[PDB]
């Protein structure tokens, strides 16, 4: 609206158009209540930089009414104002947003962008989006559109934590083309408007998310496996069958740290004790009941977890009488320690009854005919024995009550989880030792070591991290998405249950993307 | 020299003097070669902030000729220019440094400050310091002295990595007073001079040390013990006897990460294997020789470590035939794993010969009369047995060769180490199991979890970190110094070998201090 | 877009002499050495297509002159030549990186630097000026310099059938450019032009099988990687791994008999190679004598395949009754002592006298071995410097020097009956000889023309500084062979991402 | 360089460009040593004629670096000056050469032309050809 410029393409088979528009007038604050007004380096106003989570692709499949992009107008748009904002208490002013469109004269379709005031819901149809102040582009001639996005507020200047307006981009008319694999690419860049200002210098220690996250180059094999300490991580894994995870040990979150029953020192908390309560259950051998000790939950209330912190979540099976069991060290407690430590078979709760068969509680099986009454015993989970395989260990027992356990999660459609494997050694016995375990592999959703760095540099709100995985000195690079909930996903096309990736390491940070972002790189599982 | 101001104290029993001096004229660069000149927020020039490592105390014991303070003139002096410098490639300009002296009219003594040009050694006598451009203060009347410190250079503007001038402060005449516990306190504050400028905005990801270090509030008991995984850290420890450390597992450094034989995943690397080579040594039972496997050092060259990564460094003793030994799990390797895993006694190298008695090599003892020839075996260090106590485990075996092992370290005179303890459970046996371990405690210099955050935010060059340790909700606070070499020290006055500190946690960052800084808080070991 | 970063003119007031340039080199544009690259629909976003230091090497006239001077000062004016089309649309990014700053990893961090966006349909004839960010009043050779980086911003897409787009850069010194100090013209700059004396491949020696002339050049689909140790040469380092500049001279070796044996239908006796250059057998030096065989015979099948060799007992001033025996590396049934490049071997000799020197001439392989087994080399372990394994960029295949090895038969039970096989070497020392004179431009690859029938047929290969040649092939097959008439010719320097326009059809 | 002219194709789906360039300045001889200076029929200067051996075809197979055309600047370029030269002993002056290209707006590629001074070898790569005036 403010101005328009047209240029002829090379060869004179079309044109490109550059426009500047101000759909909503800007009201400039007088800043009369600001104790001090702090100016910016003048060169910051002249430097367009890419906006985090400001990229998307339009294909013939994309339908109108789906929100492709939604961003708040704040200092986080620009790379340098984001870094500067850590030294200040408040801010005021708008931004100039530039849409870059890679169009062509032999395509068809339209695009719409609009400004949403604060405290207004975003609609899900291009028809309603025309109610807002907006602008429309055509793929045949669009080259770059500059939007003078205003800073809508009812106060003199902003403190941290307010509600802010948004920019929304949507397809107005579907894309068409003779070629079946043509697609339009959209990118956003921003810079503060000349009237942008800061106020009230303060020491630079804030809770914001750093615009750039620095990841130490520690490789995966140098990281611990939460669900199987004492065994190093050997490779990364992708399985098509594993469409969900219900584990409670390898769960970490950006906001509230550990989740469910997880801990930051898996090796330290791997040990527990039981009291060997009376009672027994039937079987060809004789099985015994024991109640786990809860030092952190001395009074067995339903609010706190019912099992020792970070204890164990193998998962034996829905029903396995003489087929599958868990094997652990066990020894009677005496002064100064324990005596006669040897391998025994065990499991969770009773067998026949439901709700106690495979669940978290204090009740556990013991394969000890000579289990002394009301005496304390040691428990080192070790591994599994019988007919157990990888699948049985993968599925953890269910959780019940009101002790805010870790919720089950699934990947977005079209993506698959990435795991940390570990070879669990097999234990064999020739004499009458009692038990014989079998080889098996254990997977963990996430390791605390990787998430440790992320805590120092939090994630920007409503964004995920796109990471590069360098293996052969840069020749081979893989792309993963790291969600705040604490899992990694990859884009796949094939179907395989045994895909292996080396553990050379060197994780690298690429950029911030939306949760619905589609990874450009694709991992072919059929190979 | 430029100006002086005198004021009368309350009660008219003395005066205080404020002076501004420019001992060395400033040459202002024209910045003709700078592609862009970036200005600063004008309010940054008016904000004096404390200089990191800019505090010291003068007592009657302090003698002239000892360097109390030495700082480079760079953007790191000011809190805000340090944060701003991460966005830029170069800088140019001087600083104004203010000395604040807490003097009194009924004391005596003098103080001297000087400016050292680049590439000049700092002398160790006040007599030679008068050769430089300098200024002299008197404790009877000194209140605040402002120094216009110039930016001495022979280039148009600075890049990272140059040599810079320094400010040095020294006692000119010793302090005297009727009271025996009087002492003067000195502090430095700084702000850039009006001609300071930056140049060439670049994305803010640099290798500098952040002016403020943010420490996660994870308590010690949530951290792993490098020298004893599977046992949680239970308390912090101070011992007067332990005047040095020669360990090789709990060694981490700010610059080159792990040191000696340490690893970032102690639990994962705690396991090793041996080959059970031929030969034997005398004894009432029969002992056997075995050679440790080195997957990381397949060819046993003297350049690389001679033992498995992060394996074990207990330390049994200088000579213990039938008194002290190490006890571990052991089992013969078979397809899929190991069989007949049970506790056995072992040690390092042979017994009589020197250089192999207590040293790192592949040779180790095995307490297995039926040790099969040239067969692989598992080794889980577990613990100790016999007459071993805390002292024996504390002293690790020596290291020889040219495999850049971890050097031995000692605390500065008047300070003591702070350790991480862990109760090692005792293993008892009633039947003919073979061995019986004893309770013992294990100490580690540092845990990787604490150092993990420090890697993200490096230390400023030539500085140590002063940390606050909050225990009872802020009521009780302890002060420790964290050195880049990777150990913590505390100021003590008493003499005790069993001082215990809880593990409530909540480490906090206070400020940057010099290595010779003396902690104000004192821990009384006699209580 | 014309000038991402301002260019600050230096007065050169500290230079002892200010040496002016010919006024006419300022006026006309020339192609930038190594400034050519191509964009394809398969190119991934965020991948660096071109990286150049702002230096006198951006122009071939100033590059030639710079061999004669010790200092310089000033920037350059670049012009962009795009061979686009009407159907394809994409977008590029060009940025200036100040000296002492690391190059970013992703396109979104690159936008932090001074930059500007190119659109394929309007990019042609765009002009960019590259300033030089300097510390001193002028540069000394060996300083750290700013650099220009070009990266894919939006991937190339086409409405119609896809076309590749080829990009060229031309440059000329900016009017303030000047030299200084006038030193003799033997400085260390890489010459903008490389002159290759004419030498047909069959006139070159085959390092991995001397005594057999190179018969023809070879391209195979299956051979995806090379792990050889003999035919490895590098312009920066010279001979790599266990290579030598005199393959025939180092072919012969000797070994000393060892105690023991192993199991076999006949008897398998031990031997131990001599190491004149490694007397103490320390871990940091090669385990085997320089230039010795690196053929592989099966991963573990010590009995199915066998290497063969002439062997004779040591005698004063010579050797006696040399005859053909079998041999192989390592003791077999072991990870580190089987099919491994190390000094322990065994010989098929019924009676091998202990602690006696013996000849070892690798000759040829026998048994069930075929050329596929021969090419795979024994693995290397230890701390000594061994040649890294290499693979060509996706879409390209190696070009090998091929030699044919005659077989050997016998009526009498002399011990063996060798099998005819073919030998391949990735590089030959003779071709590298010339390159050492003229260095390669930093991080650039030589594009060579191989013309055969008096100009009628021309093949295009890329020679990498690591020491291998590759060809772009639409098809991939095992049996394709190029004649050996020869006459290599130098074409230009290209970026390693460049894709050869000329294509070789292998399936047909 | 001297001038450029642009025209729209029929249907307005592209353009055609006609240019006049003088990459190397001409030095005009004073002819002070010539016993006689003989002029030409003025109509000969206005008659473009095809140059012998001045035709070639570019296909997708043709590769850069191959010399498609190489001609000496002499009276043999023009049909009438070639016939006239038989009556004379000497000559002096340059020529105007016109390249006619049958292009189309829906193709791609580029072409380069250069002037080689006497006693200089012709290179076999477009990269080196940019060294000459072109």
Author numbering:
A (entry chain C), B (entry chain C): 1 to 527
C (entry chain B): 20 to 527
D (entry chain C): 1 to 134
Quote the study that presented this structure, word for word.
The structure of TV reveals the characteristic T = 3 icosahedral lattice comprising 90 dimers of the capsid protein VP1. VP1 subunits further divide into two domains: the shell domain (S domain), constituting the inner spherical shell of the virus capsid, and the protruding domain (P domain), further divided into the P1 and P2 sub-domains. In this study, we introduce, through cryo-electron microscopy (cryo-EM), the structure of a specific TV variant (the 9-6-17 TV) that has notably lost its ability to bind to its receptor, B-type HBGA—a finding confirmed using an enzyme-linked immunosorbent assay (ELISA).
To reduce this disulfide bond, we treated one sample with DTT and the other one without DTT to serve as the control sample. These two datasets used the same batch of viruses and were collected in the same session. The OptiPrep was largely dialyzed away for this sample. The identity of this extra density is unknown. An elongated extra density was found at the interface of the two subunits in both the A/B dimers and the C/C dimers near residues P425, V341 and M352. The pocket around it is mostly composed of hydrophobic residues (F329, V341, I380, M382, P425) with only one charged residue, D342, and one polar residue, T432.
